[PDB]
Design an enzyme around this catalytic site. Structure first.
Site, PDB file in Angstrom:
ATOM      1  N   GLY A  26       0.813  -1.225   0.000  1.00 47.41           N
ATOM      2  CA  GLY A  26       0.000   0.000   0.000  1.00 47.41           C
ATOM      3  C   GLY A  26       0.843   1.270   0.000  1.00 47.41           C
ATOM      4  N   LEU A  27       0.300   2.334  -0.592  1.00 49.36           N
ATOM      5  CA  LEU A  27       0.937   3.665  -0.630  1.00 49.36           C
ATOM      6  C   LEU A  27       0.018   4.632   0.091  1.00 49.36           C
ATOM      7  N   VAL A  32       4.220   1.027   1.715  1.00 44.03           N
ATOM      8  CA  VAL A  32       4.223  -0.003   2.757  1.00 44.03           C
ATOM      9  C   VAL A  32       4.723  -1.311   2.177  1.00 44.03           C
ATOM     10  CG1 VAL A  32       2.885  -1.479   4.177  1.00 44.03           C
ATOM     11  CG2 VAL A  32       2.359   0.949   4.088  1.00 44.03           C
ATOM     12  N   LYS A  47       5.913   0.058   7.770  1.00 46.83           N
ATOM     13  CA  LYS A  47       5.629   1.448   7.405  1.00 46.83           C
ATOM     14  C   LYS A  47       6.785   2.314   7.857  1.00 46.83           C
ATOM     15  CE  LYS A  47       2.008   5.017   7.464  1.00 46.83           C
ATOM     16  NZ  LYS A  47       0.563   5.350   7.657  1.00 46.83           N
ATOM     17  N   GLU A  93       0.669  -6.079  11.661  1.00 44.39           N
ATOM     18  CA  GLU A  93       0.094  -7.338  11.252  1.00 44.39           C
ATOM     19  C   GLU A  93      -0.263  -7.296   9.775  1.00 44.39           C
ATOM     20  OE1 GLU A  93      -4.128  -6.910  13.637  1.00 44.39           O
ATOM     21  OE2 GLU A  93      -3.844  -8.822  12.624  1.00 44.39           O
ATOM     22  N   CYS A  94       0.117  -8.333   9.048  1.00 47.73           N
ATOM     23  CA  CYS A  94      -0.096  -8.334   7.616  1.00 47.73           C
ATOM     24  C   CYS A  94      -1.528  -8.724   7.248  1.00 47.73           C
ATOM     25  CB  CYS A  94       0.897  -9.259   6.941  1.00 47.73           C
ATOM     26  SG  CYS A  94       0.842  -8.995   5.207  1.00 47.73           S
ATOM     27  N   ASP A 134      -9.334   9.902   9.002  1.00 47.15           N
ATOM     28  CA  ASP A 134      -9.254   9.271   7.681  1.00 47.15           C
ATOM     29  C   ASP A 134      -9.805   7.832   7.646  1.00 47.15           C
ATOM     30  OD1 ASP A 134      -8.487   8.985   4.935  1.00 47.15           O
ATOM     31  OD2 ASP A 134      -6.384   8.519   5.486  1.00 47.15           O
TER      32      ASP A 134
HETATM   33  N1  LIG Z   1      -4.519   1.760   3.530  1.00 45.56           N
HETATM   34  C1  LIG Z   1      -3.383   1.977   2.662  1.00 45.56           C
HETATM   35  C2  LIG Z   1      -2.164   2.408   3.486  1.00 45.56           C
HETATM   36  N2  LIG Z   1      -1.752   1.409   4.495  1.00 45.56           N
HETATM   37  N3  LIG Z   1      -1.866   0.060   4.155  1.00 45.56           N
HETATM   38  C3  LIG Z   1      -1.415  -0.642   5.205  1.00 45.56           C
HETATM   39  C4  LIG Z   1      -1.366  -2.118   5.342  1.00 45.56           C
HETATM   40  C5  LIG Z   1      -1.182  -2.668   6.594  1.00 45.56           C
HETATM   41  C6  LIG Z   1      -1.156  -4.042   6.744  1.00 45.56           C
HETATM   42  N4  LIG Z   1      -1.320  -4.845   5.692  1.00 45.56           N
HETATM   43  C7  LIG Z   1      -1.508  -4.348   4.453  1.00 45.56           C
HETATM   44  C8  LIG Z   1      -1.675  -5.314   3.332  1.00 45.56           C
HETATM   45  C9  LIG Z   1      -1.016  -6.538   3.354  1.00 45.56           C
HETATM   46  N5  LIG Z   1      -1.144  -7.421   2.361  1.00 45.56           N
HETATM   47  C10 LIG Z   1      -1.923  -7.159   1.307  1.00 45.56           C
HETATM   48  C11 LIG Z   1      -2.041  -8.096   0.291  1.00 45.56           C
HETATM   49  C12 LIG Z   1      -2.858  -7.814  -0.807  1.00 45.56           C
HETATM   50  C13 LIG Z   1      -3.559  -6.605  -0.883  1.00 45.56           C
HETATM   51  C14 LIG Z   1      -3.444  -5.672   0.141  1.00 45.56           C
HETATM   52  C15 LIG Z   1      -2.620  -5.956   1.232  1.00 45.56           C
HETATM   53  C16 LIG Z   1      -2.495  -5.027   2.258  1.00 45.56           C
HETATM   54  C17 LIG Z   1      -1.531  -2.970   4.256  1.00 45.56           C
HETATM   55  C18 LIG Z   1      -1.043   0.256   6.178  1.00 45.56           C
HETATM   56  C19 LIG Z   1      -1.244   1.535   5.716  1.00 45.56           C
HETATM   57  C20 LIG Z   1      -0.939   2.769   6.509  1.00 45.56           C
HETATM   58  O1  LIG Z   1      -1.044   2.678   7.755  1.00 45.56           O
HETATM   59  O2  LIG Z   1      -0.583   3.845   5.958  1.00 45.56           O
END
Ligand SMILES: NCCn1nc(-c2ccnc(-c3cnc4ccccc4c3)c2)cc1C(=O)O
Length: 264
Positions: A26-27, A32, A47, A93-94, A134
């Site tokens: 993620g962006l 991330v 992050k 956590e993923c 947000d």
């Molecule tokens: N929401 C978009 C930004 N953002 N994404 C994350 C985040 C946190 C934990 N896990 C994921 C994550 C992990 N595997 C993925 C696999 C496939 C698709 C999306 C996924 C997203 C993404 C944290 C943040 C942030 O805290 O800025």
């Protein structure tokens, strides 16, 4: 006497404890990245922030909120140098399941349960005086592609500490309202002025999306999307509302959301 631990900001190289990969999960402010714990080999999300004071606020607030089951857990936080540039690396956590609406596009009772979980997320934050702000769908992810998988809230970049008269989170209730709307019909209440239609409280419940839908929900969305904040529903009220409180005794009435999302 139930006392959880404090925020240990580990100072050693993160590469000592994890293997950092490229895959971007993620962006959002700052990519991330997916990383693997050397010891366990579990996948984690990393992050990375510039160690400024705003970034120490995010950490602090996320960390404090991390215990909530529907809020992405922080597992460790690191202070490292990177190109002469002090940094805060957060490990989370993923959440494999991916973004809420992506998973949609592949019922009322299901709508409710999802909304319940998001409420508990805010309920927790509010009860410890944190506004998230947000609360878009882009920050609502599932823990796995599995159908039982559970929805957790992410991204605290905009979160802020709120700390009855003689003793800001109103807008989280808006987000909820909006997120409810989309779950049911499949599209925002304010399609693309859009800025001027939001300030008026100008939205419909057009059929056939909302034909089969309940009046009970309608009036709930209505209270959530009140233009005036002070008029708008509290989190505590929201969670006491029968539709949310009783997901075990709610209609299994089908809605064509998956159809619409795949459409648009
Ligand atoms: N929401 C978009 C930004 N953002 N994404 C994350 C985040 C946190 C934990 N896990 C994921 C994550 C992990 N595997 C993925 C696999 C496939 C698709 C999306 C996924 C997203 C993404 C944290 C943040 C942030 O805290 O800025």
């Amino acid at each position: 006497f139930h006392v959880k631990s404090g925020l240990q900001i580990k100072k050693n190289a993160i590469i000592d404890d994890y293997k950092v990969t490229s895959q971007v999960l993620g962006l959002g402010i700052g990519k991330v990245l997916q990383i693997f714990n050397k010891r366990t080999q579990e996948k984690f999300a990393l992050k990375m922030l510039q160690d400024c004071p705003k970034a120490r606020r995010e950490v602090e607030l996320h960390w404090r909120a991390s215990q909530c089951p529907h809020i992405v857990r922080i597992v460790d936080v690191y202070e490292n140098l990177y190109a002469g540039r002090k940094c805060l690396l957060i490990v989370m956590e993923c959440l494999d399941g991916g973004e809420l609406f992506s998973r949609i596009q592949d019922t009322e009772r299901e709508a409710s349960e999802i909304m319940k979980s998001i409420g508990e997320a805010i309920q927790y934050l509010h009860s410890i005086n944190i506004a998230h702000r947000d609360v878009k769908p882009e920050n609502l992810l599932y823990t796995s592609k599995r159908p039982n998988a559970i929805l957790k809230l992410t991204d605290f970049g905009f979160a802020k500490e709120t700390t009855p008269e003689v003793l800001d989170k109103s807008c989280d209730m808006w987000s909820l309202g909006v997120i409810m709307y989309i779950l049911l019909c499949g599209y925002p209440p304010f399609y693309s002025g859009m800025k001027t239609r939001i300030r008026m409280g100008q939205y419909e419940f057009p059929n056939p999306e909302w034909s089969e839908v309940s009046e009970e929900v309608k009036m709930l969305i209505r209270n959530l999307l009140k233009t005036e904040p002070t008029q708008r529903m509290t989190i505590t009220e929201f969670m006491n509302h029968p539709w949310i409180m009783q997901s075990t005794k709610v209609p299994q009435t089908p809605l064509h959301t998956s159809r619409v999302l795949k459409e648009d």
